[PDB]
Design an enzyme around this catalytic site. Structure first.
Site, PDB file in Angstrom:
ATOM      1  N   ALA C  65      -4.963   2.029  -2.445  1.00  0.00           N
ATOM      2  CA  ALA C  65      -5.259   3.130  -1.507  1.00  0.00           C
ATOM      3  C   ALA C  65      -5.531   4.623  -2.271  1.00  0.00           C
ATOM      4  O   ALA C  65      -4.752   4.766  -3.106  1.00  0.00           O
ATOM      5  CB  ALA C  65      -4.035   3.286  -0.215  1.00  0.00           C
ATOM      6  N   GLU C 132       4.289  -1.784  -5.436  1.00  0.00           N
ATOM      7  CA  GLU C 132       4.818  -1.016  -4.389  1.00  0.00           C
ATOM      8  C   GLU C 132       6.372  -0.558  -4.210  1.00  0.00           C
ATOM      9  O   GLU C 132       6.835   0.420  -4.228  1.00  0.00           O
ATOM     10  CB  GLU C 132       4.354  -1.523  -2.987  1.00  0.00           C
ATOM     11  CG  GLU C 132       2.959  -1.340  -2.724  1.00  0.00           C
ATOM     12  CD  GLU C 132       1.914  -2.576  -3.321  1.00  0.00           C
ATOM     13  OE1 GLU C 132       2.668  -3.332  -4.151  1.00  0.00           O
ATOM     14  OE2 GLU C 132       0.794  -2.480  -3.149  1.00  0.00           O
TER      15      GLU C 132
END
Ligand SMILES: [K+]
Lengths: 262, 262, 261
Positions: C65, C132
């Site tokens: 992202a 993450e």
């Protein structure tokens, strides 16, 4: 003897559980299931515990399975308050914290079932895994049959289940069934090193990831519950058989068993 | 034409089924499905049969798949009484007894589907697996598509499915799709030796373990039933397509197919 | 003013290239809209028999992202189709086979594109992973639940829980990806793989894809509750202090201090 069946200790943000019955090859009786079940619940509840390691005392045996003498005394083998946690208070006892089995020696039967229930596995060179219950006239009823088919390629898993033959640590590593193989005697430090590669990460992230990965909701893996029911159902019927009586008896006279298929 | 289409022999507690149409490369017609399906049902019912091995006659072909001359004559290729057992009376025919495919040669298409439907697989060195139906305008309608994605790593299965290209026995062994690779001509002896490492165990334990491994209740694998429905629906739609006729016409006219996506 | 992705046709193959190499091919709203549209078009068009997706250049397949876009409060999804998820790609089943041509680094969102694809070819210097957990977040674009299906469970969980990367070579050995090729040659290799599929009956290939996934009317029934679980977990996680500390510490090139809240 006047000793604890399993001990718990803290190392940083890690709870280390050691099954401590090395004269009995770390077999599981009620005392073990009580201690291990309580330890897991406490690890779950304590926000400062970010990972769990379970291991067996000594270098010969991680866990030999269910304690055969305890079975013959008709003792309860499960956590007295929470039989639903299953074998060693461990196999059907989901918690948010990552669990690492540090396999310090032989892990046949219930011992493999502990490894299968754990998130990650480190084994020493001389460790081995297997489900030899079929050679004894029972089945791996603590999750082994349905979990092994998910953690090994299907054909390889079925060979292991149907023949009841062991798998070496080296072969288990090759298949991706376990994460690391290390020298005998070093499994606890290797497991702590693996834990520290996890407890460096954001604990809520690690834990949320664990629930997503398993499909766990409110401490329950929905998709596994029918597998448990099927297992319990199959095991109960099996115990009615003459072969389920014969099998343990034969191993308790070192003679070969005589199967009747009934 | 006048031999039994498949032959059964007893070897200890093992039933040995041989597809016996070597001149037709052991392709499956109604006579084969009837014989193989009957033999499976008899193995299920006999409490003294503790394992089954299936193989094909000779050293060239385990099973060539559906008999194409039979298909062109509009014949029924299934068991006349049990079309629900599917291809060869075998692929949708769950039995309690462990089954071993002794793959003695080529096993493309339907041959691979027999292997996928079996619990364990031993192959000869020159054996090969694959689902080449995509090259002809149809799909693997005997469970091949949904089972190969479960028995190989996902990306590897998808490559096999979408390209229609074969996989050698050595690669299959390396992935854990099969259990053993042996020299050409020795597969039957090797499968029986594997069966002996199963029939030495308590038969009711072995059979209960099989049911638990697959999640089978009352002879049905509930999880596969919607996969069968999907497969059959898709297969039916393709049979009706133009491209499904272009495929065989191109292989006959010895040219490249021109596909129309209809 | 610039276009963020390039869509072209090579024979019966649709080729999609994320073209933000200065942003290491990070995904913003423009990428997701163009990538989503191209997939929908590949679906609609009977002459499109396979799809290849790649990033420009040799450094990054996809960085995940776009962090600037996020910090600016921008929408990162296809403007008309949020349900398609990350890059318009990860929750967007189509009948046509998809190949990820992984031209460089593919951590996070990039690994999620690979996981969502049917097949994967990687260059030697490529790597995969879901870091993450080191950022106080999770792989909410399908990474956590799909990785455990596509690698052996113990190996998948190690990757998920440590957030450590996996080399192209080890990915190949496990069967997570299909081929490893020299750097700079991933597109030719992906098209050659594609040609080994477009030679086959298009309706067969596509029906086989549907059966292999258990897809009915474009939905993989079995994945929907996993998506729901992922969204529920992600949403709750964003409320924590750690979820702010993680990306802040990363931006500040320092070690995060986790509070476990
Ligand atoms: K077929």
């Amino acid at each position: 003897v006047t000793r604890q069946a399993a001990v718990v200790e803290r190392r940083g943000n890690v709870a280390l559980i050691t099954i401590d019955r090395p004269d009995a090859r770390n077999a599981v009786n009620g005392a073990v299931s009580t201690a291990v079940g309580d330890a897991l619940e406490e690890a779950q509840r304590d926000p400062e515990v970010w990972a769990v390691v379970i291991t067996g005392a000594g270098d010969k045996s991680f866990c030999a399975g269910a304690d055969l003498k305890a079975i013959s005394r008709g003792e309860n083998l499960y956590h007295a308050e929470h039989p639903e946690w299953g074998f060693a208070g461990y196999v059907h006892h989901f918690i948010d914290k990552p669990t690492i089995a540090a396999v310090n020696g032989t892990a046949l039967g219930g011992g493999s079932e502990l490894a299968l229930a754990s998130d990650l596995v480190i084994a020493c060179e001389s460790a081995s895994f297997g489900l030899p219950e079929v050679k004894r006239g029972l089945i791996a009823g603590a999750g082994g049959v349905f979990r092994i088919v998910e953690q090994l390629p299907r054909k390889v898993a079925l060979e292991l289940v149907l023949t009841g033959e062991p798998m070496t640590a080296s072969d288990a590593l090759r298949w991706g069934l376990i994460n690391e193989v290390v020298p005998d005697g070093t499994v606890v430090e290797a497991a702590l090193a693996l834990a520290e590669r996890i407890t460096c990460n954001a604990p809520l992230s690690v834990q949320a990831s664990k629930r997503v990965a398993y499909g766990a909701d409110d401490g329950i893996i929905g998709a596994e519950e029918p597998k448990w029911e099927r297992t319990i159902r199959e095991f109960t019927e099996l115990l009615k058989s003459e072969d389920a009586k014969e099998g343990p008896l034969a191993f308790a006279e070192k003679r070969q068993p005589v199967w009747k298929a009934r």
